[PDB]
C-alpha cells in the first residue's frame, strides 16, 4: 500500500526483463559510469604522464592508435596511491594529464563487479535455486581485484596497475615477469593447470554428451532440434558415455554420478583461479617466485648454467629496459 | 601512412559476409511465413 512497499515489490520482482535487485541499485550506476567513461577515454583522450617524468604516453584512438595499441593509460607515478577524483584536480585538463580516468573507471568497475556478483546471489534466492553460482564468479573477481587493486597497493602506485588495453596488457605481463618471476611461482603454475585442465574437462565433457545423443531427428535437419525445451526426458544415454570413458582410460576413473561429474567441472578451474589470484597478491608485496640462479656448481665452484639461468637472462633484458627513463638508482625498489 | 587496400579489406570483410548471414535469416522467416498460410504467405 505504501510507496516503499510498492517500490520494493518492483525492484525485487523476477518479472522484470532483467532482474535489478538490491545489488543492482549499486551495480547499474557503477558499471554504466565505468562504461560511459571507458568508451570516451578509449576513443578520445589526450596523452597521459604515466612515468611521472612528463613524457605523456598516448593511449586513445584519436591520437593515432588502433584496437591493439590503444589503451586507457594508468595514472601517474607522481600521484601514486593518492585518491585523485575530478573535484580534487582544479581543472579537467589537469585531471586528464595526470591519469585521471584510470581511477574513475577502475573504482567504479570493482564496485560494479562486486555488485554483479552479489546480484547473482540475490536472484538465486528469489528463484528457489541453491545459491552458489556467485562463489564460482568469485574467481575472476579475485583476479580482477588482484591486478587493478591489490597490485597497485603493494607496489604503492596505480601506475604499476594494469593498463586498460590490449598492448597494455602485455606491457603489464612482461614487466611483471622481470620484477617478480611469475612463471616459477607455484600459483601461476596452479592456474595454468586450472585453465589447461579447465579447457580439457570442458571439451572432454562436451564431447561425451554430444557423442551419446539419442536419435530424435532425421539426417536432413539439425542435430540440435531433438531437444525440445523444458522436456523431462533425458537427452543422452549417460550409460553409453560412461562405458566409453570406462574403456578409454580404465573403469574406475569414470564418474558414473552426473552430479559429482558436474561438480568437478566447477571445482578445478575456480580453485585454480583462486590460487592464481593469490599469486599476484603475494607477489604484490614482493614475495616473488622461485630463484634458482647460480644453483648448480661444480666441485671447483664454477657456476654451471641451468634452464633457470637462461630464463634469468630473459628477465634481465626486461628489467634493464622497463621504464627506461624513470629510474635513477641501481635497484628497482618499485 | 596506411595501406589503402585495407579499407576494402575491412569494409568488405564486414559487409559481404554479414549481409550473407542476414539473407539466410530472411528466407528462413519467409518459409515459416510461407507454410503458415495466414496474411503473409501469398
Amino acid at each position: 500500500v505504501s510507496l516503499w512497499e510498492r517500490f520494493c515489490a518492483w525492484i525485487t520482482s523476477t518479472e522484470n526483463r532483467l532482474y535489478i535487485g538490491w545489488f543492482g541499485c549499486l551495480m547499474f550506476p557503477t558499471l554504466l559510469t565505468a562504461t560511459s567513461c571507458f568508451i570516451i577515454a578509449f576513443i578520445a583522450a589526450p596523452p597521459v604522464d604515466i612515468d611521472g617524468i612528463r613524457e605523456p604516453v598516448a593511449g586513445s584512438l584519436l591520437y593515432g592508435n588502433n584496437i591493439i595499441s590503444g589503451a586507457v593509460v594508468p595514472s601517474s607515478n607522481a600521484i601514486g596511491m593518492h585518491f585523485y577524483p575530478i573535484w580534487e584536480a582544479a581543472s579537467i585538463d589537469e585531471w586528464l594529464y595526470n591519469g585521471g580516468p584510470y581511477q574513475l573507471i577502475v573504482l567504479h568497475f570493482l564496485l560494479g563487479v562486486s555488485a554483479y556478483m552479489g546480484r547473482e546471489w540475490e536472484l538465486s534466492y528469489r528463484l528457489g535455486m541453491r545459491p552458489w553460482i556467485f562463489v564460482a564468479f568469485s574467481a575472476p573477481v579475485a583476479a580482477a581485484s588482484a591486478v587493478f587493486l591489490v597490485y597497485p597497493i603493494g607496489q604503492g602506485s596505480f601506475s604499476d596497475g594494469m593498463p586498460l588495453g590490449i598492448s597494455g596488457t602485455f606491457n603489464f605481463m612482461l614487466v611483471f615477469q622481470a620484477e617478480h618471476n611469475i612463471l616459477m611461482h607455484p600459483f601461476h603454475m596452479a592456474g595454468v593447470a586450472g585453465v589447461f585442465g579447465g579447457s580439457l574437462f570442458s571439451a572432454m565433457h562436451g564431447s561425451l554428451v554430444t557423442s551419446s545423443l539419442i536419435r530424435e531427428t532425421t539426417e536432413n535437419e539439425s542435430t540440435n532440434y531433438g531437444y525440445k525445451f523444458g522436456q523431462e526426458e533425458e537427452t543422452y544415454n549417460i550409460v553409453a558415455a560412461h562405458g566409453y570413458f570406462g574403456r578409454l582410460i580404465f573403469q574406475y576413473a569414470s564418474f558414473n554420478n552426473s552430479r559429482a561429474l558436474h561438480f568437478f567441472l566447477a571445482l578445478w578451474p575456480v580453485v585454480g583461479i583462486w590460487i592464481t589470484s593469490m599469486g599476484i597478491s603475494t607477489m604484490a608485496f614482493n614475495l616473488n617466485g622461485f630463484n634458482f640462479n647460480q644453483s648448480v656448481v661444480d666441485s671447483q665452484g664454477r657456476v654451471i648454467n641451468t634452464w633457470a639461468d637462461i630464463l634469468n637472462r630473459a628477465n634481465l633484458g626486461i628489467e634493464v629496459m622497463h621504464e627506461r627513463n624513470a629510474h635513477n638508482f641501481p635497484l628497482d625498489l618499485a | 601512412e596506411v595501406q589503402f587496400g585495407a579499407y576494402l579489406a575491412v569494409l568488405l570483410g564486414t559487409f559481404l559476409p554479414a549481409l550473407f548471414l542476414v539473407n539466410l535469416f530472411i528466407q528462413t522467416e519467409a518459409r515459416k511465413a510461407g507454410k503458415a498460410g495466414g496474411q503473409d504467405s501469398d
Binding site: 526483463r17 568508451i39 576513443i43 584512438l61 584519436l62 593515432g64 592508435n65 588502433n66 584496437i67 525445451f229 523444458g230 | 596506411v2 579499407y7 575491412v10 569494409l11 564486414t14
Partner: peptide, 30 residues
C-alpha cells in the same frame, strides 16, 4: 580517417549485442 573505421567497428559490435539481449528469440515450453 583511419580511426573512423575502428569506431564504426566498435559501436557496430555493440549494436548486435543490444539486439541479441532484447530482441532474443524467447524460448517457450510447448
Amino acid at each position: 580517417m583511419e580511426a573512423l573505421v575502428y569506431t564504426f567497428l566498435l559501436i557496430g559490435t555493440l549494436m548486435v549485442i543490444f539486439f541479441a539481449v532484447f530482441f532474443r528469440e524467447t524460448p517457450r515450453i510447448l
